């Protein structure tokens, strides 16, 4: 069943470590039998409200076609525990 | 209907009279056709016709009214319901309205009116009162 | 619910002929599979009553079908009951 994950990376980050944290979660989804279809970044945007002391963020979108529903759970846990993502949302469609 | 189709036939006729309808159609059966034929031959309706279809068939009846209404048939009732069946001896066949009405009795030679069941001296299950 | 495929293998396995879908041998098998699937959900989710009612309704329907099959034709009933491991 297809999926869609959005997440916001903090603004104050440099391109190298930003790409590292972009690709770490792609790898973590691929650690399970979940095929990625997209990994494009949706770009810098200004938050309508300050979720943290922050005001801007890198919006990133990922498409998946998983079945076991464990890859999304592991992504949820290890993105909640990390401080390089401020907000994420998984959607089924 | 679910339980008793003869009562359904009688109540369809009664419901049609109350609003002065002209005809009515209903599902067909081997006993309903014969009841309709008795009603026609006795003089309580105008006509009966049979329309054919896939599963069981349909029967339509054309009702009868006087010159200015005055319902020819003014009352029906069922006597032997599925919850209690009543049988009448040859000397117990009821007389409806001093013979003004008729009673239908399913004897051993088909279904008969009240009058002709007293000619063969036979009896059986009474189905309905019509008057 | 059983995934459409999972239902279709059962249907194809218990067919009494090449095209049936509603014969009692098929309905009883599918209902048995469904209530077995609901058994462990009731076991682990012990406070879901609105699904327990559905389970009970399924059990009653399947029992009525079994009674009809037994009355109509005993040999089919005794073959199918051994196939499904009922009683």
């Amino acid at each position: 069943r297809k999926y869609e994950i959005m997440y916001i990376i903090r603004p104050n980050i440099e391109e190298d470590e930003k790409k590292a944290v972009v690709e770490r979660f792609d790898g973590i989804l691929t650690e399970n039998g979940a095929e990625i279809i997209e990994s494009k970044e949706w770009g810098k945007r200004r938050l309508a409200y300050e979720i943290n002391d922050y005001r801007d963020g890198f919006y990133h979108i990922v498409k998946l076609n998983a079945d076991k529903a464990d890859s999304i759970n592991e992504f949820d846990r290890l993105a909640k525990i990390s401080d390089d993502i401020v907000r994420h949302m998984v959607i089924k469609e | 209907v679910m339980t008793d189709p003869i009562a359904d036939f009688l109540t369809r006729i009664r419901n049609a009279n109350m609003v002065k309808h002209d005809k009515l159609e209903l599902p067909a059966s081997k006993i309903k056709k014969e009841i309709a034929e008795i009603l026609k031959r006795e003089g309580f309706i105008r006509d009966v016709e049979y329309i054919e279809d896939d599963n069981a068939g349909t029967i339509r009846v054309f009702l009868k009214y006087g010159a200015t209404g005055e319902r020819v048939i003014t009352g029906l009732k069922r006597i032997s319901k599925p919850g209690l069946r009543v049988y009448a001896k040859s000397t117990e066949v009821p007389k409806v309205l001093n013979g003004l009405g008729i009673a239908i009795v399913s004897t051993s030679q088909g279904v008969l009116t009240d009058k002709e069941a007293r000619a063969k001296q036979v009896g059986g299950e009474v189905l309905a009162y019509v008057w | 619910a059983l995934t459409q495929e999972r239902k279709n293998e059962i249907i194809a396995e218990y067919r009494v002929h090449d095209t049936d879908t509603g014969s009692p041998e098929v309905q009883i098998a599918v209902l048995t599979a469904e209530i077995n699937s609901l058994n462990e959900h009731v076991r682990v989710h012990k406070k879901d009553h609105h699904s327990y009612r559905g389970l009970m309704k399924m059990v009653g329907h399947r029992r009525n079908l079994l009674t009809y099959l037994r009355k109509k034709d005993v040999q089919r009933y005794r073959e199918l009951i051994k196939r499904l491991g009922l009683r």
Binding site: M6, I8, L47, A48, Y49, I51, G57, I61, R87, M89, I91 | - | -
Partner: protein, 64 residues
């Protein structure tokens, strides 16, 4: 008045499209009543779902 998505055949109100949803929220972000927007109930439900889903991702303000 006439419905928007019904006229334009828009069968999906995605939550990634902020500019479209800007029309249906008032100056404070409160969802406009269906009487003023003029949309059908079936599409109003999808619209409200999308508005809340978009609000969750900081795309639209909760209170402006």
């Amino acid at each position: 008045k006439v419905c928007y998505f019904t006229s334009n055949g828009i069968t999906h109100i995605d939550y990634k499209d902020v500019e479209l949803l800007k029309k249906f929220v008032s100056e404070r972000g409160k969802i406009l009543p269906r009487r003023v927007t003029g949309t059908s109930a079936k599409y109003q439900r999808k619209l409200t779902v999308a508005i809340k889903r978009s609000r969750q991702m900081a795309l639209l303000p909760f209170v402006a």
